Design a protein around this motif. Structure first.
Motif, mmCIF file in Angstrom:
data_model
loop_
_atom_site.group_PDB
_atom_site.id
_atom_site.type_symbol
_atom_site.label_atom_id
_atom_site.label_comp_id
_atom_site.label_asym_id
_atom_site.label_seq_id
_atom_site.Cartn_x
_atom_site.Cartn_y
_atom_site.Cartn_z
ATOM 1 N N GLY A 298 -6.864 10.153 -3.805
ATOM 2 C CA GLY A 298 -5.711 11.037 -3.648
ATOM 3 C C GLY A 298 -5.252 11.696 -4.931
ATOM 4 O O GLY A 298 -5.168 12.933 -5.035
ATOM 5 N N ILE A 299 -4.958 10.881 -5.958
ATOM 6 C CA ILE A 299 -4.567 11.446 -7.236
ATOM 7 C C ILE A 299 -5.797 12.014 -7.935
ATOM 8 O O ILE A 299 -5.712 13.090 -8.545
ATOM 9 C CB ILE A 299 -3.900 10.354 -8.106
ATOM 10 C CG1 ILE A 299 -2.545 9.978 -7.486
ATOM 11 C CG2 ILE A 299 -3.788 10.875 -9.534
ATOM 12 C CD1 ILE A 299 -1.926 8.726 -8.102
ATOM 13 N N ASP B 198 -17.655 7.745 -8.459
ATOM 14 C CA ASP B 198 -16.762 7.144 -7.457
ATOM 15 C C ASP B 198 -17.593 6.403 -6.419
ATOM 16 O O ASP B 198 -18.807 6.619 -6.318
ATOM 17 C CB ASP B 198 -15.912 8.242 -6.836
ATOM 18 C CG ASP B 198 -14.587 7.776 -6.274
ATOM 19 O OD1 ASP B 198 -14.493 6.636 -5.767
ATOM 20 O OD2 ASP B 198 -13.603 8.529 -6.296
ATOM 21 N N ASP C 268 -19.594 1.927 -8.557
ATOM 22 C CA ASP C 268 -18.663 0.889 -8.128
ATOM 23 C C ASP C 268 -18.269 0.148 -9.410
ATOM 24 O O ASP C 268 -19.115 -0.479 -10.042
ATOM 25 C CB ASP C 268 -19.341 -0.038 -7.123
ATOM 26 C CG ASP C 268 -18.426 -1.150 -6.646
ATOM 27 O OD1 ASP C 268 -17.523 -1.567 -7.380
ATOM 28 O OD2 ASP C 268 -18.604 -1.667 -5.514
ATOM 29 N N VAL C 269 -17.003 0.217 -9.798
ATOM 30 C CA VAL C 269 -16.583 -0.390 -11.073
ATOM 31 C C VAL C 269 -16.742 -1.896 -11.129
ATOM 32 O O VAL C 269 -16.572 -2.462 -12.226
ATOM 33 C CB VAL C 269 -15.121 -0.080 -11.445
ATOM 34 C CG1 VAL C 269 -14.885 1.401 -11.596
ATOM 35 C CG2 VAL C 269 -14.149 -0.647 -10.416
ATOM 36 N N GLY D 18 -9.857 5.680 -13.496
ATOM 37 C CA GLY D 18 -8.795 5.720 -12.508
ATOM 38 C C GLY D 18 -8.958 4.836 -11.296
ATOM 39 O O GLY D 18 -8.177 4.995 -10.363
ATOM 40 N N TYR E 65 -1.419 -7.024 -7.479
ATOM 41 C CA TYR E 65 -1.589 -5.649 -7.928
ATOM 42 C C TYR E 65 -0.750 -5.331 -9.166
ATOM 43 O O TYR E 65 -1.237 -4.792 -10.170
ATOM 44 C CB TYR E 65 -1.100 -4.735 -6.783
ATOM 45 C CG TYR E 65 -1.187 -3.254 -7.145
ATOM 46 C CD1 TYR E 65 -2.383 -2.567 -7.006
ATOM 47 C CD2 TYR E 65 -0.056 -2.584 -7.585
ATOM 48 C CE1 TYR E 65 -2.451 -1.211 -7.323
ATOM 49 C CE2 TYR E 65 -0.118 -1.234 -7.915
ATOM 50 C CZ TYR E 65 -1.322 -0.567 -7.787
ATOM 51 O OH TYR E 65 -1.379 0.785 -8.087
ATOM 52 N N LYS F 2 -1.790 -4.070 -13.108
ATOM 53 C CA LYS F 2 -1.306 -2.875 -13.786
ATOM 54 C C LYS F 2 -0.590 -3.240 -15.066
ATOM 55 O O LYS F 2 -0.706 -2.496 -16.047
ATOM 56 C CB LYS F 2 -0.460 -1.996 -12.842
ATOM 57 C CG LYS F 2 -1.337 -1.401 -11.730
ATOM 58 C CD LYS F 2 -2.450 -0.490 -12.277
ATOM 59 C CE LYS F 2 -3.060 0.253 -11.077
ATOM 60 N NZ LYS F 2 -4.054 1.265 -11.605
ATOM 61 N N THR G 269 3.410 7.823 -5.474
ATOM 62 C CA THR G 269 2.741 9.095 -5.231
ATOM 63 C C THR G 269 2.153 9.122 -3.828
ATOM 64 O O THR G 269 1.486 8.181 -3.379
ATOM 65 C CB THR G 269 1.670 9.289 -6.332
ATOM 66 O OG1 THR G 269 2.258 9.212 -7.652
ATOM 67 C CG2 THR G 269 1.031 10.663 -6.195
ATOM 68 N N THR H 101 -0.201 9.327 -1.328
ATOM 69 C CA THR H 101 -1.618 9.272 -1.075
ATOM 70 C C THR H 101 -1.870 8.209 0.013
ATOM 71 O O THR H 101 -0.925 7.521 0.428
ATOM 72 C CB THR H 101 -2.486 8.888 -2.282
ATOM 73 O OG1 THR H 101 -2.238 7.527 -2.672
ATOM 74 C CG2 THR H 101 -2.265 9.787 -3.494
HETATM 75 N N1 LIG Z 1 -0.311 6.355 -5.194
HETATM 76 C C1 LIG Z 1 0.540 5.737 -6.008
HETATM 77 O O1 LIG Z 1 1.727 5.572 -5.717
HETATM 78 C C2 LIG Z 1 -0.005 5.183 -7.356
HETATM 79 C C3 LIG Z 1 -1.326 5.076 -7.712
HETATM 80 N N2 LIG Z 1 -1.620 4.508 -8.922
HETATM 81 C C4 LIG Z 1 -3.030 4.402 -9.304
HETATM 82 O O2 LIG Z 1 -3.666 5.668 -9.208
HETATM 83 C C5 LIG Z 1 -5.102 5.474 -9.013
HETATM 84 C C6 LIG Z 1 -5.529 6.265 -7.787
HETATM 85 O O3 LIG Z 1 -4.677 5.858 -6.712
HETATM 86 P P1 LIG Z 1 -4.525 6.818 -5.415
HETATM 87 O O4 LIG Z 1 -5.273 8.055 -5.672
HETATM 88 O O5 LIG Z 1 -3.134 6.791 -4.966
HETATM 89 O O6 LIG Z 1 -5.313 5.938 -4.346
HETATM 90 P P2 LIG Z 1 -6.632 6.144 -3.502
HETATM 91 O O7 LIG Z 1 -6.878 4.972 -2.653
HETATM 92 O O8 LIG Z 1 -6.640 7.465 -2.786
HETATM 93 O O9 LIG Z 1 -7.744 6.309 -4.635
HETATM 94 C C7 LIG Z 1 -8.295 5.100 -5.290
HETATM 95 C C8 LIG Z 1 -9.456 5.631 -6.132
HETATM 96 O O10 LIG Z 1 -10.128 4.476 -6.729
HETATM 97 C C9 LIG Z 1 -11.474 4.488 -6.363
HETATM 98 N N3 LIG Z 1 -11.979 3.105 -6.294
HETATM 99 C C10 LIG Z 1 -11.491 2.026 -5.626
HETATM 100 N N4 LIG Z 1 -12.277 0.954 -5.745
HETATM 101 C C11 LIG Z 1 -13.321 1.381 -6.529
HETATM 102 C C12 LIG Z 1 -14.483 0.741 -6.995
HETATM 103 N N5 LIG Z 1 -14.781 -0.549 -6.767
HETATM 104 N N6 LIG Z 1 -15.342 1.464 -7.741
HETATM 105 C C13 LIG Z 1 -15.063 2.785 -7.992
HETATM 106 N N7 LIG Z 1 -14.018 3.449 -7.588
HETATM 107 C C14 LIG Z 1 -13.178 2.716 -6.850
HETATM 108 C C15 LIG Z 1 -11.417 5.111 -4.942
HETATM 109 O O11 LIG Z 1 -12.698 5.390 -4.422
HETATM 110 C C16 LIG Z 1 -10.536 6.330 -5.267
HETATM 111 O O12 LIG Z 1 -11.215 7.253 -6.122
HETATM 112 C C17 LIG Z 1 -5.282 3.948 -8.891
HETATM 113 O O13 LIG Z 1 -5.615 3.378 -10.147
HETATM 114 C C18 LIG Z 1 -3.891 3.513 -8.404
HETATM 115 O O14 LIG Z 1 -3.721 2.117 -8.708
HETATM 116 C C19 LIG Z 1 -0.648 4.350 -9.923
HETATM 117 C C20 LIG Z 1 0.651 4.388 -9.485
HETATM 118 C C21 LIG Z 1 1.061 4.967 -8.273
#
Ligand SMILES: NC(=O)C1=CN([C@@H]2O[C@H](COP(=O)(O)OP(=O)(O)OC[C@H]3O[C@@H](n4cnc5c(N)ncnc54)[C@H](O)[C@@H]3O)[C@@H](O)[C@H]2O)C=CC1
Ligand SMILES: NC(=O)C1=CN([C@@H]2O[C@H](COP(=O)(O)OP(=O)(O)OC[C@H]3O[C@@H](n4cnc5c(N)ncnc54)[C@H](O)[C@@H]3O)[C@@H](O)[C@H]2O)C=CC1
Lengths: 255, 255
Positions: A17-18, A38, A64-65, A92, A152, A156, A185, A187
């Protein structure tokens, strides 16, 4: 002055999302390369990204991280063979699911640490490397948790502290670093999620009843923070604004 | 008013430098049981502990906190079959070695979270249990890192943040919690240790030039903090004293 013009960026978790909005925002600038890593495989998103700016080469690699660091090294080798230099690494990746304790920690903290550690082999000035910039996605929960997702939030807190330490190590390694810490945010991450031991079954609903920002606004401020290029910054991206945290001085090692 | 008299305490990592002194200090009180779980096997120390206070029963169980949660559940089932009740859980395991990234995280954060999660199955009031108290050993590095061991310091940031969240969940689970965060303490942990990517090969020597406290003084203040029994406290055990820390409120979820 720092500019993204003609830079080579690796964006781990660039399709979420972000991520996807940040990738789109980055492509408004004339980067040389944007390499998206990703576990999400979405060919249609890649097509969209390639179409934004004809001057930028957009490449995707599945990643995959949570793999062992040797596997990350293998993929970085392939990417550095393709690009020769990498200017900015954005780590990210993140999951929000307190039913998955091991995986939450492996994705949000260990994986971020390992990708950073692996890229330091190519960049460390002590090894004759050119230095680099690391942008880690933390979260406001690393300052003050969402206590209903304690695992979680603790991951962080670890990312914020680790990144602040990377920045203090810049004189030694040549690699600067900072966190971009979004507030809530909109998402899919927060639309529906699991609290630890189901302490709060309505955590998503309750959280989304309070103020949030759209991912587009977060992305706008994410790239503005990258462009400010401030080592050691603890950026807060909340409610559509870009601010920075003054971390409290509770203790000092003296070293 | 809370008392340790006639209580049953489980102490994970009760034989290390801080651990063993804290175990000795706890035995100045008339506990019912002190159950020491550790990967160190030191029968002489167990015999010494048994001899301090004849009113207390001291039991040792070999335990490695990096095992999967189901294993910890098997061990806890046994301890609860042995003693029926457990009043306090002290999670004190830690390693300091930034050459061991995965293990540092697995011991310092994941293991702590897993032991906590496993004991909640027995204590959570929503499971029909009696509630309980968790004392987690953090570190001042969770407030402000030793940046030369960034992986370790991030793990301790996670423990402080996670423990604060447990304390906010006490009304729901019946389990209260607090951290004890020592400043630099004179144990074998800090005599010689590895910095991340050898950024500072003389990190132990440099750190030991600055003030340290004995492990006995840390232990005295650790037991004083347990006896204060303040849910949500963030205790700093540094330079021979006990002080609470007030955590800065940088952000609030609203929930
Ligand atoms: N949405 C929110 O309110 C907040 C989000 N965050 C952080 O922002 C980042 C993105 O979050 P969003 O876009 O909201 O969520 P999202 O679920 O849409 O995106 C998560 C991202 O991490 C990737 N990911 C997850 N596991 C993975 C793995 N094992 N290997 C590689 N990539 C992997 C996903 O494929 C995607 O690109 C994360 O680090 C989240 O913790 C930080 C604060 C607020
Ligand atoms: N000595 C210092 O300056 C500081 C120590 N700490 C923390 O205090 C705690 C005790 O450290 P010290 O006594 O100084 O060092 P130590 O090395 O003597 O003790 C470490 C303790 O953790 C246990 N442990 C390590 N890995 C384990 C595993 N896999 N399973 C079970 N137990 C395991 C050890 O067996 C021992 O009981 C740790 O959590 C450490 O991070 C916090 C701040 C200051």
């Amino acid at each position: 002055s720092f500019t993204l013009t003609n830079k080579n960026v690796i964006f781990v978790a660039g399709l979420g999302g972000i991520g996807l909005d940040t990738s789109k925002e980055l492509l408004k600038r004339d980067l040389k390369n944007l390499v998206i890593l990703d576990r999400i495989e979405n060919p249609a998103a890649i097509a969209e990204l390639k179409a934004i700016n004809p001057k930028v080469t957009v490449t995707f690699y599945p990643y995959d991280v949570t793999v062992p660091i040797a596997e990350t090294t293998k993929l970085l080798k392939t990417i550095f063979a393709q690009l020769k230099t990498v200017d900015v690494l954005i780590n990210g990746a993140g999951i929000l699911d307190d039913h998955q304790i091991e995986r939450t920690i492996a994705v949000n903290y260990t994986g971020l640490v390992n990708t950073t550690t692996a890229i330091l082999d190519f960049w460390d000035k002590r090894k004759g490397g050119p230095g680099g910039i690391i942008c880690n996605i933390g979260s406001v929960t690393g300052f003050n948790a969402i206590y209903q997702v304690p695992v979680y939030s603790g991951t962080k807190a670890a990312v914020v502290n680790f990144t602040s330490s990377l920045a203090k190590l810049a004189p030694i390694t040549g690699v600067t670093a900072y966190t971009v810490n979004p507030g809530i945010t909109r998402t899919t991450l927060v639309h529906k999620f699991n609290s630890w031991l189901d302490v709060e079954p309505q955590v998503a609903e309750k959280l989304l009843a309070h103020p949030t920002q759209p991912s587009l606004a977060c992305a706008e401020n994410f790239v503005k923070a990258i462009e400010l290029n401030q080592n050691g910054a603890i950026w807060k991206l909340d409610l559509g604004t870009l601010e920075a945290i003054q971390w409290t001085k509770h203790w000092d090692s003296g070293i």
